[PDB]
Design a protein around this ligand. Structure first.
Ligand SMILES: CCCCCCCCCC(=O)O[C@@H](COC(=O)CCCC)COP(=O)(O)O[C@@H]1[C@H](O)[C@@H](O)[C@H](O)[C@H](O)[C@@H]1O
Ligand SMILES: CCCCCCCCCC(=O)O[C@@H](COC(=O)CCCC)COP(=O)(O)O[C@@H]1[C@H](O)[C@@H](O)[C@H](O)[C@H](O)[C@@H]1O
Ligand SMILES: CCCCCCCCCC(=O)O[C@@H](COC(=O)CCCC)COP(=O)(O)O[C@@H]1[C@H](O)[C@@H](O)[C@H](O)[C@H](O)[C@@H]1O
Ligand SMILES: CCCCCCCCCC(=O)O[C@@H](COC(=O)CCCC)COP(=O)(O)O[C@@H]1[C@H](O)[C@@H](O)[C@H](O)[C@H](O)[C@@H]1O
Ligand SMILES: CCCCCC(=O)OC[C@@H](COP(=O)(O)OCCN)OC(=O)CCCCC
Ligand SMILES: CCCCCC(=O)OC[C@@H](COP(=O)(O)OCCN)OC(=O)CCCCC
Ligand SMILES: CCCCCC(=O)OC[C@@H](COP(=O)(O)OCCN)OC(=O)CCCCC
Ligand SMILES: CCCCCC(=O)OC[C@@H](COP(=O)(O)OCCN)OC(=O)CCCCC
Ligand SMILES: CCCCCC(=O)OC[C@@H](COP(=O)(O)OCCN)OC(=O)CCCCC
Ligand SMILES: CCCCCC(=O)OC[C@@H](COP(=O)(O)OCCN)OC(=O)CCCCC
Ligand SMILES: CCCCCC(=O)OC[C@@H](COP(=O)(O)OCCN)OC(=O)CCCCC
Ligand SMILES: CCCCCC(=O)OC[C@@H](COP(=O)(O)OCCN)OC(=O)CCCCC
Ligand SMILES: CCCCCC(=O)OC[C@@H](COP(=O)(O)OCCN)OC(=O)CCCCC
Ligand SMILES: CCCCCC(=O)OC[C@@H](COP(=O)(O)OCCN)OC(=O)CCCCC
Ligand SMILES: CCCCCC(=O)OC[C@@H](COP(=O)(O)OCCN)OC(=O)CCCCC
Lengths: 394, 394, 394, 394
């Protein structure tokens, strides 16, 4: 359709024009989109025809925008057009706000069960473990089998993401950061089951990375909270635009001077590359030891290197990272809000493919008062609408 | 009254119109508010009729604005209208500035007595304590009974706040942060008396929280000092808008990775959840120890977790908090000043209900030259006024 | 004079008008200030009459501006008027730049002598000390008597500051920070001589404060270096506007919670108020120890207090100070430059009262081509001038 | 030539005029520069005559701009003129992008060889070392002789820089920071060979400074990556504008108070100036020890000095450096991008003097359709061109 072709390429001017057309003419109500029904005292109502916007067949304007390949003109600004913004607010507060908070309540009760099933793991060797008849057993083994089943659930839910949208290796690593992190979490959990029944103690490695990931994935549910959701979008921007640029340059100075400190150190505990790469990393934390070794030669060389480390990477690069984060906050004060609107918009559309059996409640704002004097005949119950309101001063 | 109805809903345009009306017409001085008496060389005087603004009966415009429910249109901007701003400056420098500094001088001499009565507390067991005939006794027991009486005073003064304004469970936790903190301070002090005479050593817990709170409550008196008062408003904004958003996300990463570090640690001192949640909190301070334990397995797993902690929460989240505080300073450079004007305005109105017996000094700028040719008759001593001045250029 | 009355009150509009007047009329060259001599191709010269501006008798416009009481309208902006700004640049690069750098070269060679005379102080008891016949003696005792003489010099130079300008107890602590710090430095040095010959070892206390002050006073000479001088003005603004507002609130939380930690601590090493006020100050540095004591009761109370300290004063107030310094840089990006221009302007005028015996070199830009057809007669060598240049486009 | 005279002095208005002239007149195509060949639907082509811009004889406009003495009007803005900007983009993506990445791939494989040849250096005394017949030998000695040859290569490539451009002692230390750091790296490597065969163990000093420098020189290749290259320009600006101004003032307070701490310390381990200048430097890192010594007198003096250190240089100067970096990011948000465009432009022109034997591929955009009706005759294959494109709306 030519409407969805404007949405797919991101033509924001045309998409504003089609969703907001209105003209006073005979045989124009067959063509017009925005209808103005009630003209009372200066607050005037408005009805948007909403034909293929929300509930179209296999190509809907909400589904075209929210599933974009992130290479469009402006995928984040199209949801600010007057029919689309209030409808997603209407589908939120009426329908999906209750079913989103229940999903966050399940996942918060998922990680409590999975923590307490891992916190009280058995300590003796040779997995697996014959559960005793005690009250502590039959009560965390039920905690384990629920926690494994959650890793199975996010695995099959992670596959059917890829089986539907198919981001195809570029929109994967660019526009779908959230669904990978649910999948990699479930991937460590299933590897930790395979290593558990193969009688190896290294399952607790993959369990921990399945547990460290799982709490950091709880920032996914900060969307649906406006002040928190815009905050978690900014955390995404600091990783992709500052630690992409800091941790390259920092690890050059880190691995650079640590290889310069080893070759000066003659022998001892810190003779390896690993044991002194920590000792130069401790300056970044705030636990840097200047005299961390004595067994070398040329003390004047050894402390010029540390001072050239501390001047270059501690009182410059960490104090420069704070300044560059200070500029990307003022730059992404508006763009990070619009990216939050798109993150809510995906979660709204995801539940309509989930709670699809009761498809009547997904429809918005009634289907009535359609065709006032249609030229093809009397079809005044054809298309839906959505009521808004306006302001004063004529 | 229709004037206070504009103040209660926060109609700033109407409230500017009523307090500043003036027109040259016969039988208009009965209706006009702003009077221009002395028209000398280009500095021209101005008199504001001030009828129900300051000293009305049970609904005054200062009392309506300053006791707002924080849900109005602009409660912080209405005090910038030309009669209201200079009057609160006039009631400050003439009347309430002396009686405010005495209240800060009492409370500063309250916390010195309450500190020194707690610093020299008796150390032996089984409270209470038979005071000896020494000079040190009969000199801190008098220090205690004054300090208990201060907790009684802020308790009854905290009740009669709630018995008058009745914030009703929403304006309580939103618009009245200061009066709760005086009340909770007095609440710990009275619990520390009940535990004292019930022969339990745990009174010193509630005494300390009554003493730690009491010095932090001394930031209440930073209002009445313009450069300090605007500074303490900004401390309120950083708690409610940044540590509301930092300490949620920080404690997710903190409790997330600390539960990931326990389940890797086999046994030892740091096997509990509490003993290692401190050890990951020490990275935020600047005392983080990378090799804080050795009794585990898979050292490569244990230090990926700490590095994934330090990268995520130390060189990102603390360096992001500084950037987000850097944006909310430039955003609240003006709003935090106007909130300080409202905090002074409450303290001005609070003393008129306190020093009410000498109610003549509360009246401002005389009650004279009222009705120049009133149409109802000769009533030229009816209503008050307030003199201002103007500038040059006609 | 009415010219200096505009400079004393800071009327910048009138002062721009008097120093830049020019009109084409007969008998106007007796009244005009700005003369335009050479009108070549579009670069046009300009001559400023400069009568009472620089070299007046007992009231000169440079001396009136630069010796202001800091209560004027704009004392920092009057030096941007076109005759005054290029003249101070002319007196700098031609005359005072060489004699300023020699004063910085003496004072830099003063603190090297005074350091090395204190670094090698004798270590045995009972001052004073009979100097031996060694080569090390008769070589630092000469270093001492030069360093004492420098303290005598800054003492008498500090008195004759006050004997001339007389800031009178308000402009002292507001507009003359630099001359106090040279005086207090010399004051510790002279007290350290009185305690030296009175056979008390406490002279080394006042010597150290005379030595710690003396190197911090070397930031005085950062003026005369434009990028450094504007930087040292900003250090003055961070002390007077941020550490005036931080160190009040910080010491309230510091002394507040430290008195809350003592009264919980039963007995031991940290039972005093002083020994734990350091231990809460170490959290600000980055050396804060959470488990710094064990001899108390109610461990849950003891670590709520430390966490309520660290949350309130470390991850809030130090991270808020960086944000507030980030706003006062953008606010004082222009004002701190103009304050540097006034700090140079005082140092230019101070040497004309110092190198006064050769008063001919202090005069600027010649005294010639004065009165072209003066109406009182032929007086064409009466008043001086100063040549400038202009730009293209007619 | 008068064109290059506009480029050498940096007349950006004239240089925009000459490279973009076009007029419709007979006998104007002999004089015009910008040709508009294809006028289709509203995208219109454009051809730039490009005569002495890129491939002139001994004075080319790209070579004049990119080899400027940094004292011109705007050397960084001239590359934004419409022929020059797209041509350097054309010579990048077509020709030099492949040969730049190979140079970064060689140098990255140079420092890996030079690290691993230094990491496994022999530990016994008396250099040089008779290589054994083992497999580890004949495999790092080949690693050494490649790493020495790289120091020889950057030495002769560093000389022929100076033998061609001749920056002449002012553009050396101002406009050529990169080529010095490649040269000083090679200078330490060759000194480390001379000390190696002169049987002295101090070669490992100069090897380390040749290895610490060499990894920091890998930030040279961040140009050619747009988000990284603009980032490394900003690192240059923080060194030259903030650590030029911080490390002067910081070392005054550091050396100031450390000389004040020595003269108070009577005797012991920290009696020297060096041993306590570290202990005051550790406060900047975050490892400052307040009670780092006890053997002195007047403890009240000793901790006023440390608190006057920590207040002045830790909670002021490091927190002021972050604010001043926060202002020079917003100030150099645009200038640092244009300096990156000039750093790419030098690397493009450097390879045309390197890959000069295949000089045909250096020519851009063909040499055809030159002279449409030249007045001197038929010379329609005289000068080259370069095709661009334009936008809609007539
Ligand atoms: C141990 C590693 C932990 C990493 C911590 C990060 C946790 C945050 C989890 C999270 O919410 O992911 C967020 C981003 O976090 C990251 O991807 C960080 C990358 C770390 C390698 C949200 O990304 P989404 O998957 O929701 O995708 C969004 C987002 O990409 C946005 O930019 C637009 O593209 C679109 O709106 C949409 O694609
Ligand atoms: C141990 C815990 C210590 C907490 C430290 C904070 C001490 C500061 C005390 C203080 O002055 O409280 C200030 C705010 O501090 C806080 O409430 C911090 C909340 C911490 C949970 C002032 O609040 P007020 O009670 O004066 O109310 C004001 C204020 O709310 C303003 O926003 C507007 O609403 C109105 O002007 C008025 O309602
Ligand atoms: C151990 C204590 C060390 C304190 C460190 C600060 C050293 C800096 C020395 C210094 O240069 O003083 C500068 C200011 O430093 C301070 O006063 C800091 C106050 C610390 C209590 C310059 O002040 P001036 O004496 O030159 O006066 C100037 C200045 O006041 C300006 O604001 C205007 O008023 C006028 O131009 C003129 O009056
Ligand atoms: C152990 C010491 C390590 C120092 C670390 C810094 C490494 C960075 C290496 C580097 O890329 O050098 C960059 C600058 O780094 C420094 O010079 C830092 C100075 C440290 C004393 C790039 O400089 P260029 O040589 O490419 O020259 C450029 C640059 O000057 C620019 O400003 C303009 O002048 C011109 O575009 C051109 O001249
Ligand atoms: C969901 C599975 C939980 C099973 C936990 C379990 O078997 O341990 C039994 C007790 C642990 O108490 P103890 O500390 O005395 O046991 C020693 C630890 N292995 O459990 C507890 O006392 C606290 C339980 C907390 C659950 C939220
Ligand atoms: C500039 C030197 C200051 C005096 C210190 C000195 O010369 O000695 C060289 C060494 C060791 O210093 P020490 O005072 O401890 O001397 C003990 C002799 N091994 O210390 C150094 O080498 C310090 C190098 C600092 C470079 C920034
Ligand atoms: C307001 C009640 C104060 C009562 C304090 C008291 O009884 O102690 C008597 C002395 C304490 O001196 P000591 O340190 O020798 O006493 C041992 C401490 N228990 O008191 C002092 O020496 C200092 C008193 C300071 C008051 C501001
Ligand atoms: C989200 C809950 C996850 C389960 C946490 C858990 O098993 O910890 C239980 C106790 C610690 O008890 P112990 O350390 O004495 O048990 C010894 C275990 N080897 O510590 C606690 O109860 C911590 C509760 C803190 C909740 C915020
Ligand atoms: C990338 C490896 C660098 C060389 C170090 C190495 O392989 O050993 C693995 C362990 C221990 O390192 P060590 O050098 O101390 O080896 C001692 C053997 N236990 O150290 C680690 O596991 C480090 C993990 C770092 C991940 C960022
Ligand atoms: C200006 C007065 C200087 C007098 C210094 C003095 O008497 O000491 C003599 C020697 C000190 O050498 P030593 O370290 O061996 O002396 C032991 C220290 N008391 O001096 C030196 O070796 C270094 C002198 C440095 C001067 C800049
Ligand atoms: C606001 C004053 C509150 C009372 C403070 C107090 O009792 O401390 C008194 C002394 C400490 O004396 P001691 O530690 O020797 O007394 C031992 C007590 N067990 O230390 C001091 O006097 C500190 C005074 C600092 C004021 C800023
Ligand atoms: C929330 C409790 C988490 C589990 C820890 C707990 O309950 O014990 C109370 C104490 C001591 O904790 P331990 O695990 O070391 O128990 C040892 C018993 N003394 O630790 C505390 O009191 C911690 C207070 C933290 C408040 C933020
Ligand atoms: C390019 C020259 C490299 C020569 C290195 C060499 O001679 O050492 C031989 C072995 C070192 O293994 P070891 O740790 O057992 O040798 C003891 C260290 N002197 O080498 C290795 O095992 C690792 C080689 C890594 C090369 C990238
Ligand atoms: C501005 C110079 C002031 C004089 C400094 C001084 O006497 O220090 C001399 C030496 C230290 O020699 P020592 O520590 O061995 O002398 C022992 C003294 N008890 O250390 C040095 O020489 C430091 C020189 C550093 C200059 C930047
Ligand atoms: C303001 C004093 C607070 C009470 C502490 C006091 O008076 O003693 C002076 C010394 C030592 O303090 P102590 O409590 O450890 O007393 C032990 C006696 N040597 O400590 C000091 O000198 C502290 C100087 C702090 C200046 C900011």
């Amino acid at each position: 359709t030519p409407l969805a072709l404007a949405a797919s390429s991101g033509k924001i001017g045309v998409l504003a024009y089609i969703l907001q057309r209105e003209i006073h003419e005979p045989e124009c109500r067959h063509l017009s989109r925005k209808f103005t029904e009630w003209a009372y005292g200066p607050v005037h109502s408005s009805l948007y025809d909403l034909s293929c916007i929300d509930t179209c067949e296999k190509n809907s304007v909400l589904e075209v925008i929210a599933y974009s390949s992130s290479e469009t003109p402006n995928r984040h600004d199209m949801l600010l057009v007057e029919p689309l913004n209030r409808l997603l607010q209407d589908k939120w507060d009426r329908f999906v706000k209750r079913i989103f908070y229940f999903n966050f309540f399940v996942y918060c009760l998922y990680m409590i069960i999975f923590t307490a099933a891992a916190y009280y793991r058995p300590v003796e060797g040779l997995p697996p473990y014959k559960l005793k008849n005690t009250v502590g057993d039959y009560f965390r083994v039920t905690g384990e089998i629920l926690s494994v089943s959650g890793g199975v659930y996010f695995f099959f839910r992670g596959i059917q993401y890829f089986l539907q949208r198919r981001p195809s290796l570029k929109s994967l690593f660019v526009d779908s950061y959230s669904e990978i992190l649910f999948f990699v979490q479930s991937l460590f959990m299933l590897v930790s089951v395979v290593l558990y029944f193969s009688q190896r103690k290294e399952y607790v490695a993959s369990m921990v990375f399945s547990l460290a990931m799982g709490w950091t994935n709880m920032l996914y549910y900060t969307r649906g909270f406006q002040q928190m959701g815009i905050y978690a979008v900014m955390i995404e921007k600091m990783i992709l635009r500052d630690l992409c640029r800091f941790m390259f340059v920092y690890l050059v100075f880190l691995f650079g001077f640590s290889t310069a400190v080893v070759t000066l150190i003659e022998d001892g505990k810190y003779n390896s590359l690993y044991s002194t790469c920590l000792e130069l990393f401790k300056f970044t934390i705030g636990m840097g030891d200047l005299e961390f070794t004595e067994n070398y030669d040329f003390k004047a060389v050894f402390i010029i290197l540390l001072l050239a480390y501390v001047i270059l990477t501690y009182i410059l690069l960490l104090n420069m990272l704070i300044a560059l984060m200070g500029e990307t906050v003022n730059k992404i004060a508006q763009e990070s809000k619009n990216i939050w609107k798109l993150q809510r918009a995906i979660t709204i559309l995801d539940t309509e493919k989930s709670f699809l059996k009761c498809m009547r409640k997904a429809f918005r704002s009634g289907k009535l008062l359609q065709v006032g004097f249609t030229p093809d005949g009397k079809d005044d119950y054809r298309w839906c609408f959505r009521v808004d309101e306006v302001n004063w001063t004529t």
